Write a protein that binds this ligand. Sequence first.
Ligand SMILES: O=C(O)CCCCCNC(=O)CCCC[C@@H]1SC[C@@H]2NC(=O)N[C@@H]21
Ligand SMILES: O=C(O)CCCCCNC(=O)CCCC[C@@H]1SC[C@@H]2NC(=O)N[C@@H]21
Ligand SMILES: O=C(O)CCCCCNC(=O)CCCC[C@@H]1SC[C@@H]2NC(=O)N[C@@H]21
Ligand SMILES: O=C(O)CCCCCNC(=O)CCCC[C@@H]1SC[C@@H]2NC(=O)N[C@@H]21
Ligand SMILES: *[C@H]1O[C@H](CO)[C@@H](O)[C@H](O)[C@H]1NC(C)=O
Ligand SMILES: *[C@H]1O[C@H](CO)[C@@H](O)[C@H](O)[C@H]1NC(C)=O
Ligand SMILES: *[C@H]1O[C@H](CO)[C@@H](O)[C@H](O)[C@H]1NC(C)=O
Ligand SMILES: *[C@H]1O[C@H](CO)[C@@H](O)[C@H](O)[C@H]1NC(C)=O
Lengths: 113, 115, 113, 115
Amino acid sequence: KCSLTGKWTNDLGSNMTIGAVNSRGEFTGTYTTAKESPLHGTENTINKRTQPTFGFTVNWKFSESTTVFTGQCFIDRNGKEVLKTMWLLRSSVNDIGDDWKATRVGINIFTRL
Amino acid sequence: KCSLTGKWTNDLGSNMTIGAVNSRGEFTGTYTTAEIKESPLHGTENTINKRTQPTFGFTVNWKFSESTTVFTGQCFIDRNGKEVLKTMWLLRSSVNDIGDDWKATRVGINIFTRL
Amino acid sequence: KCSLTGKWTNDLGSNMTIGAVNSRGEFTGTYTTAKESPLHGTENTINKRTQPTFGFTVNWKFSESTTVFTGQCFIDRNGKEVLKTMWLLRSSVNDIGDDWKATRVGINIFTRL
Amino acid sequence: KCSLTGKWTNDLGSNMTIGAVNSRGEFTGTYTTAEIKESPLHGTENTINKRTQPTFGFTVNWKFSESTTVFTGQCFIDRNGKEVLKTMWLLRSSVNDIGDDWKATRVGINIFTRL
Ligand SMILES: O=C(O)CCCCCNC(=O)CCCC[C@@H]1SC[C@@H]2NC(=O)N[C@@H]21
Ligand SMILES: O=C(O)CCCCCNC(=O)CCCC[C@@H]1SC[C@@H]2NC(=O)N[C@@H]21
Ligand SMILES: O=C(O)CCCCCNC(=O)CCCC[C@@H]1SC[C@@H]2NC(=O)N[C@@H]21
Ligand SMILES: O=C(O)CCCCCNC(=O)CCCC[C@@H]1SC[C@@H]2NC(=O)N[C@@H]21
Ligand SMILES: *[C@H]1O[C@H](CO)[C@@H](O)[C@H](O)[C@H]1NC(C)=O
Ligand SMILES: *[C@H]1O[C@H](CO)[C@@H](O)[C@H](O)[C@H]1NC(C)=O
Ligand SMILES: *[C@H]1O[C@H](CO)[C@@H](O)[C@H](O)[C@H]1NC(C)=O
Ligand SMILES: *[C@H]1O[C@H](CO)[C@@H](O)[C@H](O)[C@H]1NC(C)=O
C-alpha cells in the first residue's frame, strides 16, 4: 500500500512529517523549510485504495499565508512511494480589489526521507 | 470583523456550514453539494496578526468519490458591509497509474456569501 | 454562433479588442488596463463549434511578464456572449531556484462592450 | 543567453520545435505529442529589458481535439551551462453548456530541454 504517515522530503529541500491517519482519515504533521509550521489534512478513504488521494492545509507561523496541497500517493514504476502534489499559496491582501493577485500555484514531489 | 463560523452559499448553489474555530485556528464543517450530497470539511484559519480578514484553507473529502478538493481563500469585508469568500480550488482525481498524473488536477473559483 | 472578434470588457475594468480570426484560426488584438499591450491568440477550429475553445498570450509593454488565457465562448442562458477564462501570469525571476513563486493563476469573465 | 528557437523535449517524451522569433517577439512551432500527433503552436517571447532569460507564452491548438492548452514560462540558464524551460500550463476542454464550465480547466507542469 502507500501510506502518508512518516517523513518525506521534496525536490526543494523542504522535509515533512505525518502522523497516524485516524479512522475517518484525518491526520496532522509538521512542515519544515528555510520555519516549522503546523499541518492538518485528510486522505480520501472511500474505496480504501492503495494509492490514496489526499489534501492538507498549512498555515504559516512566520506570515499570514496559507498553502493547500492536493495530491496522490503513488508506488512509482521503480517501486518507490512518491507524493505528487499541487498547491495553492494564498497571500493576505488589504482590499477585495487586489484579490486577483493573491494566489500562486505550484507543483511539489515528495519521497520517503 | 470577518468570521468563518456560519452557513455560506455560492454561485453554484452549493451550501456549506462551518463551526467555531478553536484557539489554534481550525474548524470543521459540512459541504452540501450539487441528489443532495454532504461531505465533511476540515481546515484552518490563519491567526498570525489576528487580521480582521484572514487567510484560510480547507479540504473537502468527497463521500461519493475517491477525489479530494482543497480550497484557499480570504474572508473579505465587502464594501456595502457584508462578508464575501473569494476562494480558489484544486480538484484532484484518483488515477490508477502515475503515468496519467498530469491530467488529474483541475482548478477553479468560487465565491461565497451568508446564507 | 459565438465570435471572439470585437470589443470585450471584464469584471475588473479591463477592455479588450479582437481582430478577424483568420482561416487557420489565428488572431490578434489589444489589451487595455490601468496600459495598452499587444495580444496574439488562436481559437480552436476543428469541429467548427459555436462555442469555441481558445487561448491567447499577452506580453506586457510595461514589464517583463506574460499572461496566458484559455477559455471558451458561451452563449449564456440569458442569451449573451460571455468569454469565461482562466489565466497564468508569469513573473520574471533571476534564479531557477526562485521559479516556484513566479506563477499566479486567476479567473476573468468578459462581455461585449 | 537563453534562446527559444530550437527542438525541445520533456519529462513526458513530448517534442517541440520552435522557429526564429521576429522583431516584435513572436514565433511559431510544432508540438509533437503523446500514435504521433503534430500541432501548430503560436506564442510570444517578452522583449522588454532584453533580459537573457525572458518570460514567454504560447498556445497549442490540438488537431485531434476541440481543446486548447496555453503555456507560460521562463527560459532559465541551468547551473551546468544548459537551457531549461520551466512551464506551467492550463488545459481547456470544450463543454456543451456553460453550466459545466467549472470542470473544464486542468493545470499542470512541464519542463523542457534541448533535444
Ligand atoms: O512575494 C515575494 O516576492 C517573496 C516573499 C517572501 C517569501 C514568501 N513565502 C511565504 O509567505 C510562505 C513560504 C511558503 C513556501 C512554498 S509553499 C509552495 C512551495 N512548496 C514548498 O515546499 N515550499 C514552497
Ligand atoms: O471526471 C468527469 O468527467 C466527471 C466525474 C463525475 C463528477 C466528479 N466529482 C467529484 O469527484 C466530487 C464533486 C466536487 C464538486 C466540485 S469541488 C470544485 C467546484 N466547486 C464547487 O462548489 N463544486 C465543484
Ligand atoms: O507583485 C505585487 O505585489 C504587485 C506588482 C505590480 C502589478 C503587477 N502586474 C503586472 O506585472 C502585469 C499586469 C497584469 C494584470 C492582470 S492579468 C490577470 C488579471 N486579469 C486582468 O484583466 N488583469 C489582471
Ligand atoms: O477528458 C478525459 O477524461 C481524457 C480525454 C482524451 C485526451 C484529452 N487530450 C486533448 O484534448 C489534447 C492533448 C494534450 C496533452 C497535454 S497538454 C498539457 C500536458 N503537457 C504535455 O506535454 N502533454 C499534456
Ligand atoms: C531535512 O532533510 C535534509 C537532511 O535531514 C536537509 O534538507 C535538512 O536537514 C532538512 N530539510 C529541511 C528543509 O529542513
Ligand atoms: C442549501 O441552501 C439553502 C438552505 O438555506 C436551500 O434553500 C438550498 O436549496 C440548499 N442547496 C443545496 C445545494 O443544498
Ligand atoms: C473601456 O471600458 C469603459 C468605457 O469605455 C471604461 O472602463 C474605460 O473607458 C475602458 N476600460 C479600460 C480598462 O480602459
Ligand atoms: C521526438 O524526440 C526524438 C526526436 O529527436 C525522438 O527520438 C522521439 O521518439 C520523438 N518523440 C515524440 C513524442 O515524438
